[PDB]
Amino acid sequence: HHHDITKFVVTSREKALLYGDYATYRTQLSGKLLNCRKKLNIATKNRGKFHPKTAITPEQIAENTEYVRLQLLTAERAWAHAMAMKAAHSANTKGMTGRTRSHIVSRLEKGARIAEKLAQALSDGASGASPTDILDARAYAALLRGAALFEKQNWGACLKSYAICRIIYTALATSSKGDIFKELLSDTIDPSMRFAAYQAKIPRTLPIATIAHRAFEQS
Amino acid sequence: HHHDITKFVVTSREKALLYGDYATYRTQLSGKLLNCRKKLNIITPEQIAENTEYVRLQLLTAERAWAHAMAMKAAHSAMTGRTRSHIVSRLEKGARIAEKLAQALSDGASGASPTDILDARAYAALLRGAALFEKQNWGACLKSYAICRIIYTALATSSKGDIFKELLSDTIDPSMRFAAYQAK
């Protein structure tokens, strides 16, 4: 009926982080990914290569929504792996090798690619997806792509992605009061953007009248 | 169901400028606007939930402001600063009206879908960019056109929107490139 993509994603993250961490999530996801492939009668150990595994199609999404679930779990697992390494090196990057950063970025970029293909399949080909689902998918894809460029420290490009998902999410929140979308905007999108904008020195011109009015507002 | 704000606007403009101009468009809008008030027997999210016509009332008004500014702008293609100011006042009027519609469609339990919420928001940014561009405030105008250009391109891909493309080609892109150029 409704794919509820980011609701599915935020839920899983919330599930694993209740009594656990990113290491926990990743395990949980690996189990669910496994059960998912069996339901779709898809190989768990790739050894009858009659086709290129993993190319999602609009007709397959329409046929079975589990094909969407497969993609989310796949993308979310790379995210977990990336967040887990980042967590290990939670002491300043000086602990963390430029190598580890590369692997962290690889994971996220992979998760982005998977989510991006999911959004594109959902969008055009009469997947049966509602316009809300198409927008939702795309925000999620923008979200992961934002995380990837943010970790690569490519501040401008990352701001482009986050701007797309924030705009869409702000709309989706407001339609639902987004008790899940507001948390996602509030806890992830907004803080990332503020940081990246700071790093990028965006805006170039210091808003000094804003600052003057607000600074003096406290008194 | 969808309000289809920009579709309506883009549609009304094509039709009205086919054998007429911005001045004829403005008059036609006042006629349609009058009928609209009668239906409403005379904006808040609850009013929008009750009757879709309140939304139409708001679009016609914004477009009329826009129509008027385009008409003076066309008339004075050589302009005096008082005249330029008047053109700007009206575009700003349209933006203010469209921006209020975007806010009412968004926050409340208007029943407005997220597509309509985005659409209203893009339209408001469109009018606002137009006002700032006429005001020659290039930097500010680039911010508004950036927003709606993001939204419209997003809405095109999601909703089967070969309708935004004219609006991009003839209004958004040239303004952005021109305004950005002027800001060096």
Next chain:
Amino acid sequence: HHDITKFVVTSREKALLYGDYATYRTQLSGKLLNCRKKLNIAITPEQIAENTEYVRLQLLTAERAWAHAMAMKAAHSANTKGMTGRTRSHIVSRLEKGARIAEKLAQALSDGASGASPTDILDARAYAALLRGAALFEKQNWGACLKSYAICRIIYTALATSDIFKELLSDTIDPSMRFAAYQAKIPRTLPIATIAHRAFEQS
């Protein structure tokens, strides 16, 4: 005339090019000592009218308090452990001392028949706001720190257009206000259209 910030910015650029805050504090103490003998050893407007060294005395004193805080911070920055709250507190105390001295110099410069130029009265106030921002910034009171930096940024940008004020704005004041504003979450409302436009223009 009095050249307050001109004097101070001069000293900082020179000593930190070929040294650090520890050397600066030392170099200052040499200058402070020489200054006191000429002065026969709370500032008053009349003393300033009498001799410009009373003003120089205040600069050296304020600047020395400042160098002390930085050298302290620099020394415990390279100790790998986060410095003790005791150590953070001393650093702020030292800055607040420099601010208090600078503020009192400005106040003395303002009301009394000090003989001070209008430009000089302004320069002193900016300098006092600068040291005060520095103190509040170190104290992590971002909002309070911003009021102060606002005052001196406004004043200093006027003094620039009339090559060192520009450096002072560029290298110390602007980057400090961006940080304090980030930390303070000012503006409250995220500038999404400004960001959206600039993100695509840059790439």
Next chain:
Amino acid sequence: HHDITKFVVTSREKALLYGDYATYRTQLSGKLLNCRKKLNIITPEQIAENTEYVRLQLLTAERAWAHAMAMKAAHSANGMTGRTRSHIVSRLEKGARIAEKLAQALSDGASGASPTDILDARAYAALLRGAALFEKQNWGACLKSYAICRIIYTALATSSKGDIFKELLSDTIDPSMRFAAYQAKIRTLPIATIA
């Protein structure tokens, strides 16, 4: 010394003493005439050359201001139509632009202007801009402009220990900012229904 805010605040006290914005507007057109005559046979070099170029710009901004104030006064008997509000705002914006362009010229292009002039010009332009946004009912934008001039004027107060700036803050800037802040304040009318 250009003494801009001083010149302006002085001119307003006088013309409004037993007169109004309409008389002021006429008088300014009178002054504007005398000024144009002298300079016939804005840029920083023009300001360096002759101080009257500054006077020409001031009179013009003040004339834009007086005009808006006159239209506003006519309607002080009662809700003003949006159409009229719009026209008032155009004149105020025109004055702000002139005042702002004056400030930009005074700063950079070696106009010869002292730092006190530069600040004063910056405050005055901000005063006019604040006036406009206040009338356009954009309360937030208006609070930012008035905040600038609140800071500048307090610094300039310290420069003279209260000639006119303490008053100007007391009589105009503070009251407007309190007012404008109220307008932005957005409460629920009392009701029995369950939250």
